Paper text:
Circumsporozoite protein ([name]) is the most abundant protein on the surface of all Plasmodium sporozoites and is necessary for parasite development and infection. [name] contains an unusual central region consisting of multiple, short amino acid repeats whose sequence depends on the Plasmodium species. The PvCSP central region is composed of nonapeptides GDRA(A/D)GQPA and ANGAGNQPG characteristic of strains VK210 and VK247, respectively. The central region of [name] is immunodominant, and antibodies targeting the repeats can inhibit sporozoite infection.
Author numbering:
A (entry chain P): 3 to 20
B (entry chain C), C (entry chain A): 1 to 52, 52A, 53 to 82, 82A, 82B, 82C, 83 to 100, 100A, ...
D (entry chain D), E (entry chain B): 1 to 27, 27A, 27B, 27C, 27D, 27E, 27F, 28 to 213
Write the structure that this text describes.
Amino acid sequence: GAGNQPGANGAGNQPGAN
Amino acid sequence: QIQLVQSGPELKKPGETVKISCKASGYTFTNYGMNWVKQAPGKGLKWMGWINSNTGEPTYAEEFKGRFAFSLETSASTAYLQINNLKNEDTATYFCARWANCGCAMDYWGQGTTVTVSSASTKGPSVFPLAPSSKSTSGGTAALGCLVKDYFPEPVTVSWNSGALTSGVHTFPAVLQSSGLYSLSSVVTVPSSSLGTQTYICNVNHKPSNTKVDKKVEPKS
Amino acid sequence: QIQLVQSGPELKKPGETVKISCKASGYTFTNYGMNWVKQAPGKGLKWMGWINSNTGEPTYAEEFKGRFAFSLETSASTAYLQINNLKNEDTATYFCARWANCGCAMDYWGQGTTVTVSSASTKGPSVFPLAPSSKSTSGGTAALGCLVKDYFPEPVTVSWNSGALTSGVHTFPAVLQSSGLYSLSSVVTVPSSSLGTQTYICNVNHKPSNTKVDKKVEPKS
Amino acid sequence: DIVMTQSPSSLTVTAGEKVSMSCKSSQSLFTSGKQKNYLTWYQQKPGQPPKLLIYWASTRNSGLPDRFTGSGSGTDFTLTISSVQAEDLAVYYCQNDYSYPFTFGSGTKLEIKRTVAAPSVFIFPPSDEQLKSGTASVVCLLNNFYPREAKVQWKVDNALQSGNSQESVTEQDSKDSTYSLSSTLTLSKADYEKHKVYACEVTHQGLSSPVTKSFNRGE
Amino acid sequence: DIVMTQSPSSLTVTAGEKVSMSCKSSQSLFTSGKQKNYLTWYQQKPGQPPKLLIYWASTRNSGLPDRFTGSGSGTDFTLTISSVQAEDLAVYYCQNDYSYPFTFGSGTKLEIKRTVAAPSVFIFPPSDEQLKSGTASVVCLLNNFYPREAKVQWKVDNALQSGNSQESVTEQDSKDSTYSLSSTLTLSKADYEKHKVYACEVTHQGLSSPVTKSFNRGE
């Protein structure tokens, strides 16, 4: 449930784990 | 349920501060972020920004950096919009809308808080009954109504018999008269034989002036 | 290309505001987030935070909440770092660095913006030629140079023959003299037979004082 | 940042016709990872917040009838209603949900055309509670007519006014796609008591000859 | 949150030796889902931004020669250069990339030791443009020597100074691993005109007996 990240879930906009 | 219930309307003089609440209920509050959307009167939708309900940190669009503030009370499931140093540009209707489970649309929306910025101060409305039709109409449809004259600012809430009578009602758009104030009329069509022995109450609520008026519209020819 | 090009150096009095730009080019800007790294003079690296180029959301480390701001202009592929209420702690070199395609390292880096916080104001540099005299050793060893005295703050950019002459150049670290100002010297070794009939221009640039000086270093004997 | 150019401005259709409306974005909204477009269609029925219709450019929302269908990919997108009902009149907004800022479009307004309906006309005497004040206003009411265009002339002692008149026209009805109009004539109490005819004359598409409803002051 | 304790601070090696350096984290950096360590090694050559060397604790970057190798797992990690070259002198930083905040280490500085190089000595008269001002400063230059330690004494009329002198020493060179030094003697114009010898005396490991370069004022 990724409602607190909108938009395109890029890898370079979502670092670490995860 | 899943309801975003938003605060009441505000009239504020320019340069002041307004703070709108959006109380959420029915979902895990810290898992869906909160959007704010401005709608100017008669105009389209404008995305103001979004606050992360998990980290607390806001994200504003470029037209809203600096004077606008997003905040949260997670312990009461409530989002806040604070507009500092009010201008006449800021007179609008403001919506909160939570980001959907996908993170790709705005799932649920508040009802909207209307904020009017004006140097003028509040005038209560005058409620006068529109007397059921003296002249006999061809069929048995008899029109009656209620008139809400000389108020400021928008909005007013009119209903009939505390919300019982709903069909046949036309609440009209408030037209702006030359005094600077607003005037409005609400008409309802009923059967002719039901006039007399069945009361008709017109319920007007003006929220910036604390004016709740109930008015019996009784026939007179 | 794939280049992060960052703004020029800044001198600011304490308590003021500085805003550094980082213009990205050569890749889809909205798919890689932007990091900011502070490096104090002579010290190590410190991770300040990162802004999500896709959602707009900044993330600051605990040592940088409150005075520091990350922002974006997506239509020009530029990230901004704004430091408000400058202190002498804030005198550093600041880097922007995009998160790599994995999301596990910082791929590409800006050149670095040096920000000096000081109550003093700018002094332009004095550029004096270090004479290619008759001190030439065995055969074609001849030293010449350029002296950059009495300036504040760091940095200065010196080059030789507008960037043509590159090898044999030692630009020295600026040593701080007792007057409070900096002085620096840049020497280049050339062949002795090439002194005369081949001109040597020393190109000094001090960006906080708007001082671009070209200086012919001509042999004296 | 992304411009959501939506088209047309307004569009007027008979109930049952097929309706297409376009939303074109200045960048692609296709991700290549999830293999779907981040575009959303919303409905704002008048006096309400926007209602979510379609997410992921094609997937209709939980509850929505099947006549609303979204197509298109990358740049050009299209919302289609296959048979418009009388309650579908609203404004339709597309939203970029691909990248910050999550911008909206200008919106397409949907208006219904129907057959001619002549207005039913009612005239109202001013209330005595208003007559306790210095002003007195008389209203005329046109109920359930099509089209919007209508002509109201007030006649006091068979002499037609030019000031004092305000019309207000309702939104188009969610059940029968008609309009309603209120013309209000605002006088002083003294100039109201000087005359006694107080007529309202209506010219409309549905009326073969114009229609006067009147009350002379008193019973 | 995570503390990146890096070791040693500096280490000095001959060109061609094998070099190991340690980075130890206060929490584990292994994810257990994607089955890889989130640790990164960066190189900061002097005067430059950091260059990415190794991500995922072992994967070298696109372009990097194979002598840089990263090992370790979970808590203890290790960067290894198998044959240091003269351009590898830099400061090497490890970074936590597992969880916020993505903290760095204190860095390991890598310095080259080489054979003895004696300095070449150059003396410069003060420029006439400077002599139009109130100050006059003479510089002495030591070029391309090893080791760093060198002794410069100024002798004006065979009388050795104690103030007025500033040395500046360059970074170690990426081609030949040597150093350069500039000693600057700053006088007033009047104290410059009172004397005429202006000598520079250099003591260094590469010189069997010390070396004086001089110019007498005028000639």
